[PDB]
Design an enzyme around this catalytic site. Structure first.
Site: not given
Length: 383
Positions: A135, A223
Site C-alpha cells: 500500500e 489483500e
C-alpha cells in the site's frame, strides 16, 4: 433464464485462493488450522496461497517458519510483502506514517528483500513471489512506506534483474489504483522484471485492468476483507464475500488473497472452525483448482444471479453461481465445445455448508436445467 457456455473461449488462468499468516501481529495459526485451511477435502477450505509479512527486523523472521513450512508441505505457494523498509533506510527515520525509501538505499533494500528470500528457502519454505511494497498510497500509524509509480519504475530499472526467478509483485495499492502501476507498465525496461500486478480492494470494487493484461502480467488481489465488525457466521454479510469473489473472477484476476485466515471476521473463527465466509471461499477454492482456465459463460443471466465457469486441468467443468434473490432460481444451461454428461450440486446458504444437493443430467445437445437455492453460493462440478 439461459446461460450460454463455451468451453473453447478462455480467459485467465487461476493460480488459487489464499489468506494472510499474521504471526508477529496476531497469534500464529496451529497445525490443525493450517490443515483445515490448506487441505481441499470435505470440511476444508482449499487455499493454496499463503501471504507472509517481511519484518524490517530480521531477528524476527524465524517466527514465520512453522506456518510457512506447513503451507508449503500442503502444496501452497508463499508470497511475501514488506510493509516498511527498516527505519534507517527512509527519509523520516521511522517505520510509521509513511516516509520514502531513499534512492541511495535502493540496492540495500533489495539486499534486505533477498536476504528474506534466502532465509525462507534455506529453511525449506521457499517463496514463489515477492512484493516491493504494501500500500504505497497509504501512510497509517503502523509500518508503511510511500512511493510513487515513477519511483517504482526507477527502482525496477536498476534492481529488477536481481530478483531472478522470484516473481515480483507491484504495487499493492490500497485501492488497486492504476496510477501506481501505469508508469511501470508503460516502460518496457521496468515492466520486463514484473510478473504480477497486485492490488487491494479497500474502498473499491474489482475492475478489469487492460494495460496489465495486454502486457501479459497476471492480476492478483493480494489483500481484502469485508465488514470486520460482523461475525464471520452472519450470513447477510458472508454472502457479500461471494459477490466480491465473482467480481474478482470476472475482472480476470488469477488470485484472490484474504486477510487474516483466523479471525472473528475471518475464514476460520477463533475456535478454529470454518466460518460461513470460509465456506463461501471454499465454493471457489475446493473446486476451481490451480491451473484452471476461466471460460465463457453468461455472467448475469437474470436479476441478482452472477456466475463464472471454469475448466480444471483434469477436465472437470465447474460453475460457481451467486444468487442474492430470496427465491429459488432456475438456470437453463447451454453448453458448447464440452464433453459433460452430469453436474453435481453443492451449496452454501444460511443453513447449508457446501452440501450436496443432487445431480443434473446434461442432454447430448449440451442442455441441462439446474436450480439455485435462495441467498446461496452454489457450485456445479461435472462428473
Amino acid at each position: 433464464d439461459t446461460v450460454k457456455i463455451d468451453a473453447n473461449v478462455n480467459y485467465q488462468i487461476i493460480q488459487g485462493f489464499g489468506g494472510m499468516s499474521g504471526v508477529g501481529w496476531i497469534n500464529d495459526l496451529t497445525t490443525e488450522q493450517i490443515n483445515t485451511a490448506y487441505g481441499s477435502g470435505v470440511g476444508q477450505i482449499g487455499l493454496s496461497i499463503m501471504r507472509v509479512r517481511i519484518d524490517p527486523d530480521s531477528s524476527k523472521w524465524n517466527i514465520q517458519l512453522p506456518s510457512a513450512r506447513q503451507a508449503v508441505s500442503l502444496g501452497a505457494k508463499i508470497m511475501a510483502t514488506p510493509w516498511s523498509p527498516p527505519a534507517y533506510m527512509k527519509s523520516n527515520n521511522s517505520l510509521i506514517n509513511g516516509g520514502r525509501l531513499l534512492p541511495a538505499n535502493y540496492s540495500a533494500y533489495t539486499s534486505h528483500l533477498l536476504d528474506f528470500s534466502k532465509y525462507m528457502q534455506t529453511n525449506g519454505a521457499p517463496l514463489y513471489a515477492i512484493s516491493i511494497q504494501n500500500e504505497p498510497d497509504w501512510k497509517p500509524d503502523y509500518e508503511s512506506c510511500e512511493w510513487s509509480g515513477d519511483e517504482f519504475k526507477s527502482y525496477l530499472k536498476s534492481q529488477g534483474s536481481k530478483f531472478g526467478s522470484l516473481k515480483v509483485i507491484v504495487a499493492e495499492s490500497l485501492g488497486f489504483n492504476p496510477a501506481l502501476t501505469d508508469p511501470v507498465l508503460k516502460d518496457s525496461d521496468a515492466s520486463k522484471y514484473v510478473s504480477i500486478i497486485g492490488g487491494h480492494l479497500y474502498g473499491t470494487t474489482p475492475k478489469p485492468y487492460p494495460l496489465a493484461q495486454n502486457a501479459g502480467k497476471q492480476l492478483w488481489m493480494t489483500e481484502h476483507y469485508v465488514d470486520s465488525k460482523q461475525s464471520a457466521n452472519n450470513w447477510t454479510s458472508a454472502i457479500e464475500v461471494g459477490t466480491e469473489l465473482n467480481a474478482s473472477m470476472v475482472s480476470n484476476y488469477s488470485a484472490y488473497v484474504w486477510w487474516y485466515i483466523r479471525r472473528s471476521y475471518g475464514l476460520l473463527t477463533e475456535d478454529g472452525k470454518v466460518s460461513k465466509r470460509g465456506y463461501v471461499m471454499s465454493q471457489y477454492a475446493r473446486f476451481v483448482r490451480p491451473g484452471a482456465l476461466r471460460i465463457q459463460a453468461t455472467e448475469n443471466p437474470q436479476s441478482n444471479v452472477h456466475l463464472t465457469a471454469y475448466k480444471n486441468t483434469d477436465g472437470k467443468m465447474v460453475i460457481v453461481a451467486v444468487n442474492t434473490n430470496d427465491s429459488d432460481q432456475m438456470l437453463s444451461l447451454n453448453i458448447s465445445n464440452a464433453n459433460v454428461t452430469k453436474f453435481e450440486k453443492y451449496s452454501t446458504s444460511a443453513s447449508l455448508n457446501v452440501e450436496y444437493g443432487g445431480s443434473s443430467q446434461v442432454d447430448s445437445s449440451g442442455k441441462a436445467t439446474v436450480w439455485l437455492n435462495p441467498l446461496s453460493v452454489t457450485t456445479f462440478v461435472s462428473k
